């Protein structure tokens, strides 16, 4: 078959279609019009957008396709380096860091992180317990305070103290602006035009703010734990026996500070959004939290018991996966779906929110929020649900994210009743990652002691 392709702009091919603040949402509307696969061309490059489980299940065969750096990831690599997110599977520092840092996500490590996650969660709850009755909550802003602080503490034994700040933390502000710039660069035909000189200076300034904080964290540890930073500094790869060098360490710290909170803030924000928009689901979730979290602070085992909360989080990741794309390349010539021949090196993009709206998998109710879809993972076809990527390049933090989000959402639902007081209209801000923008609620304390 000849694959469909959205509208073109002469020598610019499809590139001007990314001239939007909301490119993933634009691509989804394209996929709506064109179907399970379309070509996307730009000067000097081509990729193919996949949206069906039918095709994506083939793309997830690691014998045929390896992780690719998308254009977006290539631009992020300017500050993520060859850390785990942005390294090719075949670069020595991928498997070496993977082997050295994977012990930081063992169940043993997770049990040990639990107390420090509670420390941040309690801070969130006390903030909300302390608001006057006229006040409201800025949801993605507070979920970023929580999630940044959690990775800072658990990962690095470092306190960002975001709840002691009325503006976002400076690290956040620079992070957002760096991700924004990377996103905006996707549409630039002439990236070296002098009209982009200020963007470039701004980008280098934001990358410096981030690296200055890495330096503080590294200096704090040298002056001072068994955590992610301990493994980075002292850990030895069993295969090669070497430790990470200093350059890679720095890339890994910035990688983990960003990738280990931004998307979890998004998830928590979407989940609360869907709960306030779906009162019967909120009741059921709140019923579980009340039944399970019987102690003044949750235990590790209790968070593991919050099954339905877990399902709410998975359903929120189904509709709005917060890292909404990943990319693959063909390891050899191969044919996709019996219909689309690919050559070695051809690029694919998995459009995750559109995969997760495949009516052949989920049914016709795909836009509805129904956590019960997730009651039994065996009843879901292979590769239908991919918010955490695929295979040996899958998200290393998945359990850390989901434990944190399940603990915090559980406490939220135990401690407060929530009101969508403004009848908020979903507005999804894109910074490569996805988050509701301007989402606000009021929270009425149930007055249960902490
Ligand atoms: C809901 C939250 C999260 C989502 C939706 C998310 C999603 C993803 C996805 C889609 C990938 C694959 C990227 C690709 O194939 O190019 C990825 C990889 C990665 N994630 Fe996550 N993630 C989350 C949370 C976390 C957290 C909390 C951490 C750290 C504690 C983390 C660390 C990483 C790392 C290091 C990789 C690269 C792994 C490798 O290739 O070796 N993520 N994640
Ligand atoms: C058109 O090209 C695009 C557009 C938006 C996109 N958003 C993404 S999200 C890709 C991604 N995945 C995983 C992690 C861990 C990560 O760092 C937090 C990022 C940026 N990729 C895109 C590619």
From Swiss-Prot:
Biotechnology: This protein is a target of protein engineering. Its selectivity-directing and activity-enhancing mutations have been extensively studied and the designed mutations allow this enzyme to act on non-native substrates and/or in order to enhance production of synthetically desirable end-products.
Swiss-Prot/TrEMBL site (Important for catalytic activity) positions: 263
Effect of residue 323 to V: Substrate binding affinity increases 5-10 fold and the turnover number increases 2-8-fold for palmitate as substrate compared to the wild-type
Annotated consequence of substituting residue 259 to H/K: No significant stimulation of NADPH oxidation induced by addition of fatty acids and no hydroxylated products, but cytochrome c reductase activity levels are identical to wild-type enzyme. More negative reduction potential with dithionite
Effect of residue 388 to H: High substrate-free turnover rate constant. Negligible substrate-induced spin-state and substrate-induced heme reduction-potential shifts on addition of saturating concentrations of arachidonate
Function: Functions as a fatty acid monooxygenase. Catalyzes hydroxylation of fatty acids at omega-1, omega-2 and omega-3 positions. Shows activity toward medium and long-chain fatty acids, with optimum chain lengths of 12, 14 and 16 carbons (lauric, myristic, and palmitic acids). Able to metabolize some of these primary metabolites to secondary and tertiary products. Marginal activity towards short chain lengths of 8-10 carbons. Hydroxylates highly branched fatty acids, which play an essential role in membrane fluidity regulation.
Family membership noted in the UniProt record: In the N-terminal section; belongs to the cytochrome P450 family.
UniProt name for this protein: Bifunctional cytochrome P450/NADPH--P450 reductase
Classification lineage: Bacteria, Bacillati, Bacillota, Bacilli, Bacillales
Residues of the full protein shown: 4 to 456 of 1049
């Amino acid at each position: 078959k000849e694959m469909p392709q959205p509208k073109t702009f002469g020598e610019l091919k499809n590139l001007p279609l990314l001239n939007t603040d909301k490119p993933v949402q634009a691509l989804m509307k394209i996929a709506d019009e064109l179907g399970e696969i379309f070509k996307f061309e730009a000067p000097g490059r081509v990729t193919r957008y996949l949206s069906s489980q039918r095709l994506i299940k083939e793309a997830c065969d690691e014998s045929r396709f390896d992780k690719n750096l998308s254009q977006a990831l290539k631009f992020v690599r300017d500050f993520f380096g060859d850390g785990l997110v942005t390294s090719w599977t075949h670069e020595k520092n991928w498997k070496k860091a993977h082997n050295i840092l994977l012990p930081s996500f063992s169940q043993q490590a997770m049990k040990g992180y639990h107390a420090m996650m509670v420390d941040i969660a309690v801070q969130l709850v006390q903030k909300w317990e302390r608001l006057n009755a006229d006040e409201h909550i800025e949801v993605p802003e507070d979920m970023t305070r929580l999630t940044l602080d959690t990775i800072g503490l658990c990962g690095f034994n470092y306190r960002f103290n975001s709840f002691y700040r009325d503006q976002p933390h400076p690290f956040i502000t620079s992070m957002v602006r760096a991700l924004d710039e990377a996103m905006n660069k996707l549409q630039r035909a002439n990236p070296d035009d002098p009209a982009y000189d200020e963007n470039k200076r701004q980008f280098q300034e934001d990358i410096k703010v981030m690296n200055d904080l890495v330096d503080k964290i590294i200096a704090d540890r040298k002056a001072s734990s068994d955590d992610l930073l301990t493994h980075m500094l002292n850990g030895k790869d069993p295969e090669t026996g070497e430790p990470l060098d200093d350059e890679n360490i720095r890339y890994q710290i910035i990688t983990f500070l960003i990738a280990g909170h931004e998307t979890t803030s998004g998830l928590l924000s979407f989940a609360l959004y869907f709960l306030v928009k779906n009162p019967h689901v909120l009741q059921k979730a709140a019923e579980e939290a009340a039944r399970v979290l019987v102690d003044p602070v949750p235990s590790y085992k209790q968070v593991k018991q919050l099954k339905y909360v877990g399902m709410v989080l998975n359903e929120a990741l189904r509709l709005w996966p917060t890292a909404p794309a990943f990319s693959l390349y063909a390891k050899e010539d191969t044919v996709l779906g019996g219909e689309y021949p690919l050559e070695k090196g051809d690029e694919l993009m998995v459009l995750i929110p559109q995969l997760h709206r495949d009516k052949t998998i989920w049914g016709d109710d795909v836009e509805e929020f129904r956590p019960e879809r997730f009651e039994n993972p065996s009843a879901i076809p292979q590769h239908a649900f991919k918010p955490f990527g695929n295979g040996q390049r899958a998200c290393i933090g998945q359990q850390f994210a989901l434990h944190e989000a399940t603990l915090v959402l559980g406490m939220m639902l135990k401690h407060f009743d929530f009101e969508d007081h403004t009848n908020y209209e979903l507005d999804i801000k894109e910074t490569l990652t996805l988050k509701p923008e301007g989402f606000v609620v009021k929270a009425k304390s149930k007055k249960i002691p902490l």
